[PDB]
């Protein structure tokens, strides 16, 4: 903000907030996939025991 005009500084941060938020989405979707496999492997152990 200290090197660019505040009238259109929203444009550059918009390219930044979207990119930052988008990567947070990718990490969450990875956890959903992993949790499904663990739950599948948890029930198999719960059946063996």
């Amino acid at each position: 903000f200290s090197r660019l005009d505040k009238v259109e500084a929203e444009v550059q941060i918009d390219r930044l907030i979207t990119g930052r938020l988008q990567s947070l989405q990718t990490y969450v979707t990875q956890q959903l996939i992993r949790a499904a496999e663990i739950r599948a492997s948890a029930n198999l152990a719960a059946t063996k025991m």
Binding site: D5, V7, E8
Partner: protein
């Protein structure tokens, strides 16, 4: 609708735009960041001068 009239030099026309930093736009008059509308400027050398 709002109308504001004044007479300015040719070297300080640009400072009316929002986000402009300068002498006339800091101590006399300036527009907010979310300004809506526009201005019309034309020579008055025939009459005002």
């Amino acid at each position: 609708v709002y109308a504001d009239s004044f007479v300015i030099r040719g070297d300080e026309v640009r400072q009316i735009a929002p986000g402009q930093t300068g002498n006339i736009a800091d101590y006399n008059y300036k527009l907010p960041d979310d300004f809506t509308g526009c201005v019309i400027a034309w020579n008055s050398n025939k009459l005002d001068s």
